[PDB]
Nucleic acid binder design. Sequence first.
DNA 1: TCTAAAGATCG
DNA 2: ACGATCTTTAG
Length: 245
Amino acid sequence: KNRAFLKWAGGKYPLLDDIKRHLPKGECLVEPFVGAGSVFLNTDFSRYILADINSDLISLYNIVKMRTDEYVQAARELFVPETNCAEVYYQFREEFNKSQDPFRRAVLFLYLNRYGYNGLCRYNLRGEFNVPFGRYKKPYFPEAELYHFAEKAQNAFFYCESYADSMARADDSSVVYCDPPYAPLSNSFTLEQQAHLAEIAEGLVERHIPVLISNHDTMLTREWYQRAKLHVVKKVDELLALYKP
DNA sequence: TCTAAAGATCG
DNA sequence: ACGATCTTTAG
Ligand SMILES: C[S@@+](CC[C@H](N)C(=O)[O-])C[C@H]1O[C@@H](n2cnc3c(N)ncnc32)[C@H](O)[C@@H]1O
């Protein structure tokens, strides 16, 4: 069981076993909401199509892939005891937001993810990262996870685009796994998008393309994924919607 | 999920 | 320039 090098919400590590158990077999795996890519790191497809709306995220993934050794050596320099304090953090955060170099931003991005408050990723309407200092004892530099990501990424393509466009890339030999932002328990992921995602899923399964969707087990998710074989996992339970052709 | 301060929106 | 009400910001 492999871990990602990034702290990221929606890490489905406790549910990885349940996901792989319902995930159909295929040649290519498509992930419209790849995030930390825990599913990508713990499956075994011959090729992957990985996408996310976060441009900083996708940019990092490309750099780690194409320029692995150069990146690891550069990013490791920021994981020294001297950098674990507020003043250094807020200057590095300011350097990230003012940098126009993809490589430097990707290097600082890992630092901010490991030293930032609760590993959050928050922006303002200007696209500026504004997560405060995290105050951890000693942040772990995920060197092993980085190299393992780069190796598996050799069979993956990273795109920065909405789910509708990424799911449009899926063909006959493709399996689509969707891990959308959690449905509410009653710039966010609106209810209309939640419903639209299920609609696109029904379109793919009508074209003989397998689609698996994970989400909370609420009334809305039941109504959204009504045309799928629902599976309940595990307060609020977890739901798996399988669209089998 | 929290909040004080600053900006946005309308008639 | 007013003022109530959100909206945004960032620790
Ligand atoms: C809940 S996270 C899941 C991450 C991933 N499953 C993991 O293991 O880390 C959902 C991700 O989808 C991305 N996302 C949000 N809205 C999107 C949209 N409208 N289209 C495509 N991706 C989106 C977000 O950037 C977020 O990282």
